[PDB]
Design an enzyme around this catalytic site. Structure first.
Site, PDB file in Angstrom:
ATOM      1  N   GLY A 109      29.584  31.747  46.560  1.00 27.01           N
ATOM      2  CA  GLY A 109      28.802  32.577  47.520  1.00 27.01           C
ATOM      3  C   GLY A 109      27.321  32.543  47.141  1.00 27.01           C
ATOM      4  O   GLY A 109      26.700  31.499  47.121  1.00 27.01           O
ATOM      5  N   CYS A 110      26.750  33.677  46.843  1.00 26.38           N
ATOM      6  CA  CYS A 110      25.306  33.708  46.466  1.00 26.38           C
ATOM      7  C   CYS A 110      24.451  33.139  47.602  1.00 26.38           C
ATOM      8  O   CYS A 110      24.301  31.942  47.739  1.00 26.38           O
ATOM      9  CB  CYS A 110      25.201  32.826  45.223  1.00 26.38           C
ATOM     10  N   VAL A 111      23.890  33.989  48.418  1.00 27.83           N
ATOM     11  CA  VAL A 111      23.047  33.494  49.544  1.00 27.83           C
ATOM     12  C   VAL A 111      21.838  34.415  49.743  1.00 27.83           C
ATOM     13  O   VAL A 111      20.827  33.936  50.230  1.00 27.83           O
ATOM     14  CB  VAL A 111      23.958  33.535  50.769  1.00 27.83           C
TER      15      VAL A 111
END
Length: 111
Positions: A109-111
């Site tokens: 993820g990480c956005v």
């Protein structure tokens, strides 16, 4: 939420850890009791039928090539599953649902 996540639990001499959103974070101790356990607390299934383990098995093989979890529209290209039947088998969402019971941690993820 049905399970206070994140939270830990024990099943048949085993340790199952659940991260935020009740995500499986311990694929090292995954088994038939763990998969059927979370599926029983979420869907209520008391006895994993032959279809649940069927699709869950095909995905377990693809997770040994790159380590991801595709949808269910591409698996049909080499299987023969109907989106309608799978829909009635899962809570309107066989995508993250199946992978979850399989024991696959989020990709990136990480956005």
């Amino acid at each position: 939420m049905p399970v206070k996540c994140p939270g830990e639990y024990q099943v048949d001499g085993k340790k199952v850890i659940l991260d935020e959103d009740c995500f499986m974070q311990n694929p090292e101790d995954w088994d038939e009791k763990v998969a059927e356990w979370l599926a029983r607390e979420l869907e209520g299934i008391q006895k994993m039928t032959e279809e649940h383990w069927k699709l869950v098995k095909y995905l377990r093989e693809y997770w040994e090539t790159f380590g991801t979890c595709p949808p269910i529209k591409m698996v049909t290209k080499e299987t023969g599953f109907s989106l309608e039947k799978i829909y009635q088998l899962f809570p309107s969402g066989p995508a993250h649902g199946a992978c979850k019971v399989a024991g696959a941690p989020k990709p990136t993820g990480c956005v």
